[PDB]
Amino acid sequence: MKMNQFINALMAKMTLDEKIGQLNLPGAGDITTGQASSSGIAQKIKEGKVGGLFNIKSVTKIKEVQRIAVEESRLKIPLLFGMDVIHGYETAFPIPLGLSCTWDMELIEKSARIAAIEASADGICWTFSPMVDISRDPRWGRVSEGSGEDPYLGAQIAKAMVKGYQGKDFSDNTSIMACVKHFALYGAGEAGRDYNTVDMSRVRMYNEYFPPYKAAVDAGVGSVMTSFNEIDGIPATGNKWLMTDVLRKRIGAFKGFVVTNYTAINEMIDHGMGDLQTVSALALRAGVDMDMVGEGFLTTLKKSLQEGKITQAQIDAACKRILEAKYKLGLFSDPYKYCNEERARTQIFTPEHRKIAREIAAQSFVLLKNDNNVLPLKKSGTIALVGPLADNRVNMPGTWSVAAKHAESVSLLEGLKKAAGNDARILYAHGSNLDEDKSLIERATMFGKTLKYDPRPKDVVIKEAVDIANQADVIVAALGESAEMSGEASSRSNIEIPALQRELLQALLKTGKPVVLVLFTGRPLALTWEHENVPAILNVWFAGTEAGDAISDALFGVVNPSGKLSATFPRNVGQVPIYYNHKNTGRPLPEGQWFQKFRSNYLDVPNDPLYPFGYGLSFTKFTYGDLKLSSTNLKGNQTLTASIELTNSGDYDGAEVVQLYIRDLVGSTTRPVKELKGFQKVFLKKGETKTITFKITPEDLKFYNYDLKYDWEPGEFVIMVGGNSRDLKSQKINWLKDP
Amino acid sequence: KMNQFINALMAKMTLDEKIGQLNLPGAGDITTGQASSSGIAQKIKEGKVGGLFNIKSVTKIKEVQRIAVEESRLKIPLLFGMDVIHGYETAFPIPLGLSCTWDMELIEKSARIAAIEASADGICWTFSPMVDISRDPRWGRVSEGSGEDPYLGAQIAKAMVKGYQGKDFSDNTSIMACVKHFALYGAGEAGRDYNTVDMSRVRMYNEYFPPYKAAVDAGVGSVMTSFNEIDGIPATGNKWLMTDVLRKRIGAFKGFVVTNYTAINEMIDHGMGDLQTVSALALRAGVDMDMVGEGFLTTLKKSLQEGKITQAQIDAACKRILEAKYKLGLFSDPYKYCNEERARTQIFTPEHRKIAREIAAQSFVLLKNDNNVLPLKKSGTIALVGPLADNRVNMPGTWSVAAKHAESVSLLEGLKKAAGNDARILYAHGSNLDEDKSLIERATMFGKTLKYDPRPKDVVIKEAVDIANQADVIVAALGESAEMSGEASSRSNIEIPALQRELLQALLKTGKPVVLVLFTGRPLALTWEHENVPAILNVWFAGTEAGDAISDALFGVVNPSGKLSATFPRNVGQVPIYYNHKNTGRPLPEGQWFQKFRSNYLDVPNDPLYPFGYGLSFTKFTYGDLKLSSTNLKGNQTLTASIELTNSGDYDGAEVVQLYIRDLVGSTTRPVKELKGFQKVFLKKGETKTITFKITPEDLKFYNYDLKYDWEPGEFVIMVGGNSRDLKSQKINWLKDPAFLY
Numbered sequence A: 001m002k003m004n005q006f007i008n009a010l011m012a013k014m015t016l017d018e019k020i021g022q023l024n025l026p027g028a029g030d031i032t033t034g035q036a037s038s039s040g041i042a043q044k045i046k047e048g049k050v051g052g053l054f055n056i057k058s059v060t061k062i063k064e065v066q067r068i069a070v071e072e073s074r075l076k077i078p079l080l081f082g083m084d085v086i087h088g089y090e091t092a093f094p095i096p097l098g099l100s101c102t103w104d105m106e107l108i109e110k111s112a113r114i115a116a117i118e119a120s121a122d123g124i125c126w127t128f129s130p131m132v133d134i135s136r137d138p139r140w141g142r143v144s145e146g147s148g149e150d151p152y153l154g155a156q157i158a159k160a161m162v163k164g165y166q167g168k169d170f171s172d173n174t175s176i177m178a179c180v181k182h183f184a185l186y187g188a189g190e191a192g193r194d195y196n197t198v199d200m201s202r203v204r205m206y207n208e209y210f211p212p213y214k215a216a217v218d219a220g221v222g223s224v225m226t227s228f229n230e231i232d233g234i235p236a237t238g239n240k241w242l243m244t245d246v247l248r249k250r251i252g253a254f255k256g257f258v259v260t261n262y263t264a265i266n267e268m269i270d271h272g273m274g275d276l277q278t279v280s281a282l283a284l285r286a287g288v289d290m291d292m293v294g295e296g297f298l299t300t301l302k303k304s305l306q307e308g309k310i311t312q313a314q315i316d317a318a319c320k321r322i323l324e325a326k327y328k329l330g331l332f333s334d335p336y337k338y339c340n341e342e343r344a345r346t347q348i349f350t351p352e353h354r355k356i357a358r359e360i361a362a363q364s365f366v367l368l369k370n371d372n373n374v375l376p377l378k379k380s381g382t383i384a385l386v387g388p389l390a391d392n393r394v395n396m397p398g399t400w401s402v403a404a405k406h407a408e409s410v411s412l413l414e415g416l417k418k419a420a421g422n423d424a425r426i427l428y429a430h431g432s433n434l435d436e437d438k439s440l441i442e443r444a445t446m447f448g449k450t451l452k453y454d455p456r457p458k459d460v461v462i463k464e465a466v467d468i469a470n471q472a473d474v475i476v477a478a479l480g481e482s483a484e485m486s487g488e489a490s491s492r493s494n495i496e497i498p499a500l501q502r503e504l505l506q507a508l509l510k511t512g513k514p515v516v517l518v519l520f521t522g523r524p525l526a527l528t529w530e531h532e533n534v535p536a537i538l539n540v541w542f543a544g545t546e547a548g549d550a551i552s553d554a555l556f557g558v559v560n561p562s563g564k565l566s567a568t569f570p571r572n573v574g575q576v577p578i579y580y581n582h583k584n585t586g587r588p589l590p591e592g593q594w595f596q597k598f599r600s601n602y603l604d605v606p607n608d609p610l611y612p613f614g615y616g617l618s619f620t621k622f623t624y625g626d627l628k629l630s631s632t633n634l635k636g637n638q639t640l641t642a643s644i645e646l647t648n649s650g651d652y653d654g655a656e657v658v659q660l661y662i663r664d665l666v667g668s669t670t671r672p673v674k675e676l677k678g679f680q681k682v683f684l685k686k687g688e689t690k691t692i693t694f695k696i697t698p699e700d701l702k703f704y705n706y707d708l709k710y711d712w713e714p715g716e717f718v719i720m721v722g723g724n725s726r727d728l729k730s731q732k733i734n735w736l737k738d739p
Numbered sequence B: 001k002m003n004q005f006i007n008a009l010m011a012k013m014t015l016d017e018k019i020g021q022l023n024l025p026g027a028g029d030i031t032t033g034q035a036s037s038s039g040i041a042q043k044i045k046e047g048k049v050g051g052l053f054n055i056k057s058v059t060k061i062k063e064v065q066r067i068a069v070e071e072s073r074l075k076i077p078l079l080f081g082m083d084v085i086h087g088y089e090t091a092f093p094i095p096l097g098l099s100c101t102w103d104m105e106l107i108e109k110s111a112r113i114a115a116i117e118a119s120a121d122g123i124c125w126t127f128s129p130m131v132d133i134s135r136d137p138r139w140g141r142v143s144e145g146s147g148e149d150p151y152l153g154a155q156i157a158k159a160m161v162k163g164y165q166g167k168d169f170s171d172n173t174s175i176m177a178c179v180k181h182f183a184l185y186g187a188g189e190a191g192r193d194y195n196t197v198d199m200s201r202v203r204m205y206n207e208y209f210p211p212y213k214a215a216v217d218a219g220v221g222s223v224m225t226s227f228n229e230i231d232g233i234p235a236t237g238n239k240w241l242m243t244d245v246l247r248k249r250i251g252a253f254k255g256f257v258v259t260n261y262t263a264i265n266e267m268i269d270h271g272m273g274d275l276q277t278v279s280a281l282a283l284r285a286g287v288d289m290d291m292v293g294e295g296f297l298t299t300l301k302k303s304l305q306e307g308k309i310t311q312a313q314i315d316a317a318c319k320r321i322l323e324a325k326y327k328l329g330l331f332s333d334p335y336k337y338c339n340e341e342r343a344r345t346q347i348f349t350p351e352h353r354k355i356a357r358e359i360a361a362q363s364f365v366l367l368k369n370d371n372n373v374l375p376l377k378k379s380g381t382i383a384l385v386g387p388l389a390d391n392r393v394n395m396p397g398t399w400s401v402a403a404k405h406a407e408s409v410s411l412l413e414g415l416k417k418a419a420g421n422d423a424r425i426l427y428a429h430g431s432n433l434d435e436d437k438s439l440i441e442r443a444t445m446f447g448k449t450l451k452y453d454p455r456p457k458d459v460v461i462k463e464a465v466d467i468a469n470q471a472d473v474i475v476a477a478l479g480e481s482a483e484m485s486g487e488a489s490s491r492s493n494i495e496i497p498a499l500q501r502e503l504l505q506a507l508l509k510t511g512k513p514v515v516l517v518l519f520t521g522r523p524l525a526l527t528w529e530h531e532n533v534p535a536i537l538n539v540w541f542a543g544t545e546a547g548d549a550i551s552d553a554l555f556g557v558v559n560p561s562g563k564l565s566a567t568f569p570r571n572v573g574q575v576p577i578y579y580n581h582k583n584t585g586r587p588l589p590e591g592q593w594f595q596k597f598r599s600n601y602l603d604v605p606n607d608p609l610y611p612f613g614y615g616l617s618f619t620k621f622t623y624g625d626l627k628l629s630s631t632n633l634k635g636n637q638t639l640t641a642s643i644e645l646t647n648s649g650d651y652d653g654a655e656v657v658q659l660y661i662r663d664l665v666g667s668t669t670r671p672v673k674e675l676k677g678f679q680k681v682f683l684k685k686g687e688t689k690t691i692t693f694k695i696t697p698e699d700l701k702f703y704n705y706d707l708k709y710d711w712e713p714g715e716f717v718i719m720v721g722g723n724s725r726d727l728k729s730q731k732i733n734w735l736k737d738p739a740f741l742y
Ligand SMILES: OC[C@H]1O[C@@H](O[C@H]2[C@H](O)[C@@H](O)[C@H](O)O[C@@H]2CO)[C@H](O)[C@@H](O)[C@@H]1O
Pocket: A598, B261, B487
């Protein structure tokens, strides 16, 4: 009895309403433990009207709910239990944007593995993750959930995430089904405003935005979630071209199912697509399989079928897909597969898990500036820790951490005191609130992620910090955003550090003491003034439940920072969108020659971002020899070997991310000045040299041309290697086809 | 006839002579007195020059044309072109400013006068109008266009072509127009000039193309390509664009295509290949004339010998250039536009300046007028303060290459004239343009300098404050310099320069009522100014008559009647923000900012500061309820929509009544509203008039997902008011007629 036979047999037993019921993923409402079977959701499950549920927590609650299905519904079809497990379950790793800066695919996969272990131990068998939306717009709150602006890096991370979640077998009780989102183009919302209109050409979609989604699918992701945005004037959720012709294009078949985003079907009414029945039929016809919360499928599909607006086959295909996911997950052989109390008791938020998170977090930090050897700090003397983010636990996990043990996180103050012990004195001061305008603080600290609010006049509180700082040999400024300043529906028209904090920072600098800016953020910020005036800048994103410890490992040099930016840091928001893989234009500005009239440039700011893609410093220094190519004249399907000597020429052991970029000089369409095509993170002891090697083939040269044909064209290419997208060793080559 | 004449001419022509017609080189300096031995002379004699541009003075142009007529083998005369953008010697407001008149008659007149002056000076071809839609205030070239709306843009494009070209090309008072820049130029990424452009086909057709199309339908003689790529192919080499779109219908276009300045050569930089390759690409795409770069002149013959182009491609391009010259009357009289007497009497005349002054005053947009600050009483004392208070050469704005910049009327000048003996005007610099001198320098190129005060800003501010304290009202002339906009004048910051904001603050702090007369070439972020300044008059850049026109507004000689053609954002973080937007699936209900999980920001409302079509008056206008002839229509019927407008204020005035239509449901998402009509009407104080609009299914059509141009049966909302924001509305139902389905 293989899957297809079993599933066909089952569906032959089902009524029309039961098939439709499988397509329903409703909101659950409150469920009183001890009386699940008589709760609001119970009746629906009993009537076969529920295919799955989500964001229900605890194996105890889940088992009982699952028992209603197994024992009290006619066919005893078990439910899927999903959740947003985004960057950890109870143990929280850094936010995804932070994790992507590790450029370490092993660590990425590992964090996903541990998340799956924890979530599955607590009854969850399906996560709405990874989010792989490409974005070039820092205003958008959701950049925190993604992996930056690059399709290659993004695609690599997609594979790592899906593999971590899903393992080699869906039926394993430590593996959960992943869900790539949000298909598609969500990250191009106009003016960085969440949910706003998206528009772009087909050729831009294929080269610049689609690749990460495709990587997830090729990796075997089990499901796909639709996006809130329209494309070509049709909401993704109702977009047949996208959901059928692209997603399920013959060769490269996606086998899983498509679930809508939260009431995305109903929102098509607001989009302007028609009434609930109309937009529901549109969604099903497009290839949508499961309806999240809005119940458009449940309440309208029969009427449409009776009216011949949809077919039985359409309903059947969607039903079968849901049932197949359940079968693959092991639910028809054991509906309680993911419900073991002892696993939940022993495998969640363990000391070992927290240790791994701590180690992973330290490798996500990006050191953006370190003048005059300020870092690492000596573990002696006195250290002043100042800022609205110095001593707060609940913000450390950042946004999208619904299952995290927020109140058990390690504050920076806590982590610092511990690491220092009796070797160094740690002094503390609030310094300032998150921002002037209390109402902004409030909407930025939703979901219980509150900060201590100081009712005293800002000058009073600053004077307090300055006077404390004057007693220290070095100041550590913990500034930046709060957790919920990014995330969903957290768009900012201003991407600077809040004025109040900058005013505070100014006061700290004026003490004359060395200041280290420890920066908390869920997005790229505009930091020109900070870069000019602060000796050392460490971007720690949001590091998770172990933030305080991981950050202290960095500060004292237990761990040498090795992160690299996966997204461009602009000089101001007026530069947006600014990104490394751009076209040359017909009037490029020669490097270093800002400003030039009649070139492509601004009157009031240079063209360069502040920090480019791939940027990141170390406590040590890395020296690149000259790029060596095995050939500069290639023919057909040959392999080019590119190699380079890398030397740790600094004072500390450390790792660096070696990056490979390729520029296609001439094409039938304009080609980007460069695109990432490989990378390698390597650790080097002080004074050690290693040969780093990349192997290139024509596959690395391919792109989607004007007719959307994926292929490469003969001609000249530039091969580049270095420690960021700007500082590169390069060499030109000629690559020819052959008859 | 023309066809027989040109065919015969072309039969006499050598390959090189045909190629030469396609050349539009830079001229280099031509010493008046020895044009026939100048640098450009030899090339003309050899038949290598199809035309020239930016040569000025009928005297010079006459002697250059003589070279072609008397000293070339076939005597084929030249076109003479120029950027006549908003007036020749008499400067009208910058285009964006002109757009705010919402007066198509006035607009056509300004073009008419501009053609009269240019043609009188030997010019027979203008690189105008630029009709690029833009939703990005950062782009300095918004100043050259007409805002963010396709319908208003299309109406203006039509009015401009009509004004220039008149009834017949061969009139010595008509010149050939050139709609630019085809296409999509105004969507350059991050508002940085020349930067990458990218969008969907369906957005192109509904949102960006219409103005270009109206130019063509109005009979524009030529089209200029743009610098941006499209779908990864530079416009100048984009065959789909230049041939499939531009020349889709039978005899739709029929004119010729010229490249932008070295746009072919720049395709090399784009990454499309070498000069020959990109030249051949351009010719195949449908480009006919090569501006400055000489890629056509130097490479076409080789490409032809190599089979990369065809003879017929060269012949077709050459043919179009000759037809242009034929239509313009050049083969009948190569000197037609070369009359010394016309040039002496018909240019920068008192009459022309008067008209410019009239038009300018109609282009101003009154953004705020609290507590009846405006209009000013012509009595007591008035303090004029700001870096734009007393400067002539900036008044004409950018793209005013033929303007009499130095003869422009400064604001101090106009005000003192108007005040006469009735009020005393007091002046003070207040501050420089910006705290950054190198920014000032680069923002005041092309000779448009501002006098620089080397004293400490605080000393100068105090100087102005002490003057202000002597006045009963203060007039602050602040904003941009002329060349802070225009080409390659992109700004990442769209506020009034910080130094000036600081000055402004010190003025308000005097307790005196302050009027902000704002000089700008772009929308600016003005939330703070709107919050603190009693009155705000946006004067754009009004031309050579700026001071007189502005003074007309200030004292109430002319009741301001302009309305924004582009949205004013609260900050650059909202960009792009525009009125004709999609609803999204999570729209923020009106008045409800902030709402979590709706489409909105944490730190700023969704609303711009001032919406499309916004404009105040010295008086007030009351709208009655919207009357519709029917709520249930079928097939090709006419809906009549009427409304009572009443002047309920204290002054005579005009207001622009705007018609918007919303298509509620569609096979694709439809914008929450679209401008579909307008009428500007003058009303005596207390007068009431019935404004009427005729609506048909044509007004309902759009380009669907498959790019089919059609309307769909269903509900629509008809809206009327003096704002894209404040409207009377009514829903209707419109069905197809089964009988007439074809
Ligand atoms: O001046 C208008 C016209 O100038 C064009 O050429 C520039 C050129 O780019 C620059 O190198 C030189 O120093 O100045 C000349 C003339 O100003 C420019 O390329 C055009 O876009 C511009 O419209």
